[PDB]
Each structure stands twice: as structure tokens, then as C-alpha cells.
Amino acid sequence: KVSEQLKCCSGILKEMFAKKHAAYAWPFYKPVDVEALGLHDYCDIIKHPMDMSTIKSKLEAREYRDAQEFGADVRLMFSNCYKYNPPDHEVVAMARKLQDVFEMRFAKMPD
Amino acid sequence: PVLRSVNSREPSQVIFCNRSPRVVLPVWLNFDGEPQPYPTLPPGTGRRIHSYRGHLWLFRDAGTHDGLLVNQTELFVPSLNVDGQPIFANITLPVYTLKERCLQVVRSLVKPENYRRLDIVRSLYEDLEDHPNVQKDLERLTQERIAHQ
Amino acid sequence: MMYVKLISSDGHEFIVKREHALTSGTIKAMLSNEVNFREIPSHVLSKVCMYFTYKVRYTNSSTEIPEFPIAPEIALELLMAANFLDC
Amino acid sequence: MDVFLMIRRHKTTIFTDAKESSTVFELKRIVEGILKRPPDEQRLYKDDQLLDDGKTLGECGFTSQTARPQAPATVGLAFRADDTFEALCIEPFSSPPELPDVMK
């Protein structure tokens, strides 16, 4: 019942990583390198960081109870990006582009 | 303009590593070509940097603005990452001329207004007052780049 | 290698390799065997030779290059010497 | 690594590079090639300490870390005359002028 969906969740993330949606998903692959990007304030603002590589590990480690918990992390990822950056920022525009893909697939998941 | 970064918006993870005794000042040429100074790197230190594909860099001394080398060259331009591996930028001293190296020492020990209180030849006053400039060095490289074509 | 004798004003003979001496453009011109300098003192000329060694060694070197040291006092004379010797 | 030396006698000074592995006798062959003086008529010192022909420059104390191109370590030299060796004599270089007020 639930294991059916959790495997479909993996299928979604694979498409998010895929070269098809490469142009506007590349910031969200790995964690936010505060050193490289030089974001001293980031850790104060964002209490719970998240990225696609982190979510990938949790799926393989069976750390999500159900498909609903998987979504929360994917949404947290974009939520953090929206929270930190201003509306007209580039990463935000890309965040929306990738999210609109996720939302389409997560909505059309069978049950 | 000739020497300028390309607004690619394509990621390129870099590692600046100050393997020199100077306090390095990373300088980034913007999309128009105007240099932007970034936070300094202490001697014998380094850190990860998130630059982008086709972005010009150059490195100087934070104090004296002396020219340094990065991978046995003046300008640094990141490639695209292979298997997401970081592009290293080994910042080091050049082999300074005995004259230019002597100037650097005199410059550091004597103020600009005390240059004409030194028991030296007239010509050396101009040489001392002729400090190392970034904009001046970029105008040379631009002309050398044109000569190469 | 071929060696050359560089004599100071105060009569201190310095035997360096010919290749090392050719770093100086003045000396390059002076030759084309034994060279003499009427102005430069010993301690200055000795430091100039240490540069030749430093220059020849660390040129085209992938091994990171150390800073060439110049003490405050010798700086002034060495600057003039460097300007004279064209290097 | 390579060691960089200043082989000095009286007012003479030879700038020459060597290895840590190379011997004092091999160093005396460099002195012979320049100053026409054979090893048997040579005495090489480290400060006051006399050096053996068989021992290496590394064994003598000359390390590449200490003896660098820009800061080469000095090596005393004394020749033989009338079948007797002279006491080591090295004339020092001239003094730089005292630091001017502007440079202080």
C-alpha cells in the first residue's frame, strides 16, 4: 500500500535529477555550501536545511514512513530557497520551475 | 570589452589556495569588465568557491596590490566540473625581478611623500611612485591578447 | 659550467656560473670574461649573486616559490644595484 | 634535495649548488675545477668544525631547508703552502649604512 508509493517517490526524484530538467535543478542537487557561496547568515535563517541528495539517501535508507513525509522534505527544500532569497532572485525562479514539475508528478501518483 | 566574465549562470566549484606568504586579494572581472575585490585569503590558507563557467579571475596582494600567479599564469578561468570535481587554483608568488622586488621592500618601509627624501637616482623616484595597478595590468593583457590573434 | 668573476668596489671576488650572471642584462652586454664594478660594495654584490641562484632555480618551477628576502638596510643600495645591473 | 653554498677563502666567494648526498671530496673537486687547487691541498670547514672527505654534506649538517638559493650556507676554505695548512681566514663583507629615519 505505502511501499508502492515510496517506490514511485524514488521515480520522481530520478526525473528531478535527470538531464531533462538539468538547467533549473542543479542548485538543489547537493547541500547549500555556505563556505563556497559565502552565506554566513544562512544557518541562522534556515533552521532545517535540505537538498535532493539528502532526500535520495533517506529513500534508500527507508527513513520515510510514507510518501507524505517524502513530500514535506521536497517542499522544505523549496521553502528554504523561497525563505532566504528575494522574489526576483534567479534561484527562486528555478526553484519554482522544478517545484511545478514535482507538484505535477506528486499529484498524479496512483493510490 | 575584451577581458570580462561571461554571464553563463553555469556552476563551477573552485578551490582558491593561497600557497604564498602574501595576504591574497581575489579579484573578479564583472560582465562589463570592471574588477570587483573579494574577501582576502591569509597566507597558507584556502577555501571552496562557487564561481561559474567562463568567469575571469586574478589575484593580488591585499596590502601592496602586487601581481601574483594562479596555476603558473596571471588570469584564471574555471572549466566545467568533471564528475562534479572541484577546479583547483594554486595561487603562488612569481619570480620577481631584483629591481621590482627591491621597490616592494622600499615601498613598504617608506611612505609615498618620503620617496623624494631618499639618496637615489632621479629615475628611481618615478619607479617607486609607479605603484602596481590592476587597471594598468589589464590594459597590457588586453593588448597582448590582441597581438596573439 | 663556465664560471665568471664578479669583483666588488671593496675587492671581494665572487665566482658564479656564467648562465647565472647572464640574468643581468648589463653583464650580458659587458661580456659580449672577468668583470669588475667600481661602485657596488661586497654585501650588495653578494646579495645580487644570491638572487641569480634564486632566479635560475625557481624560474619555470612547479614547486611553489619562496619570497626573496631583503633586509631593510641593504634595500636602498640593492635597489640602485638592481637598477644598474638591469634585472 | 639540493643544497646551495658559499665556499669562501680570504676575499674569494664561490656560489655553487650541490646535493645532500654528495661528499666533501666531491665538493673539493668543484673547488679544484675553479681555483686549480687539488683536494689534498684543501681544508673545508663548517663554521669552526673541520669536515671529512668521506662524509656527505647532509651528514656534515648542510640541509636543503637551511641552505637555500636565496640564503646559502657558508663553507670555510683554507689552502696549503710550504707543506703546511693555513688557519681558516674569511674576510667579512662591507657594512650596510644604518637605517635612515624615513625607513624606520
Residue numbers in the entry:
A (entry chain A): 349 to 459
B (entry chain D): 61 to 209
C (entry chain C): 16 to 47, 58 to 112
D (entry chain B): 1 to 104
Source paper text:
PROTACs are bifunctional molecules composed of a ligand for a target protein of interest, and a ligand for an E3 ubiquitin ligase, joined by a flexible linker. Recruitment of a protein close to an E3 ligase hijacks the ligase catalytic activity, leading to the tagging of the target protein by ubiquitination and subsequent proteasomal degradation. Our first crystal structure of the PROTAC MZ1 in complex with the E3 ligase VHL and its target, the second bromodomain (BD2) of the bromodomain and extra‐terminal motif (BET) protein, Brd4, revealed that the two ligand moieties of MZ1 (the VHL ligand, VH032, and the BET inhibitor, JQ1) lay in close spatial proximity within the ternary complexes. Inspired and guided by the crystal structure of the ternary complex between our BET degrader MZ1, VHL, and Brd4BD2,10 we designed a series of macrocyclic PROTACs with the aim to lock the PROTAC in the bound conformation.
Macrocyclization was achieved by adding a second linker to “close a circle” between the two ligand moieties of MZ1. KGaATo validate the binding mode and deepen understanding of the molecular basis for the biophysical properties of macroPROTAC‐1, we next co‐crystallized VHL:macroPROTAC‐1:Brd4BD2 and solved the structure of the ternary complex at a resolution of 3.5 Å. The structure superposes well with the ternary complex VHL:MZ1:Brd4BD2 (Cα RMSD=0.6 Å) and recapitulates the major PPIs between VHL and Brd4BD2. Conserved contacts include the previously reported electrostatic interactions between Arg107VHL, Arg108VHL, D381Brd4(BD2) and E383Brd4(BD2); and the stack between the canonical WPF shelf of Brd4BD2 and Pro71 of VHL. Collectively, these interactions result in a buried surface area (BSA) between the two proteins of 681 Å2. The MZ1‐portion of macroPROTAC‐1 binds in an identical S‐shaped conformation to the uncyclized PROTAC, retaining the H‐bond between His437Brd4(BD2) and an oxygen atom on the PEG‐3 linker. The cyclizing part of the linker optimally fills an additional cavity created at the interface of the two proteins next to the ZA‐loop of Brd4BD2, which is in good agreement with the MD simulations. The BSA at the macroPROTAC‐1:VHL and macroPROTAC‐1:Brd4BD2 interfaces are 961 and 1064 Å2, respectively, which brings the total BSA to 2686 Å2. Closer examination of the additional linker revealed potential clashes with the ZA‐loop, which could explain the loss in binding affinity with the BET bromodomains. Within the ZA‐loop, the side chain of Leu387, as well as the carbonyl oxygens of both Gly386 and Leu385, are less than 3.5 Å from the newly added linker.
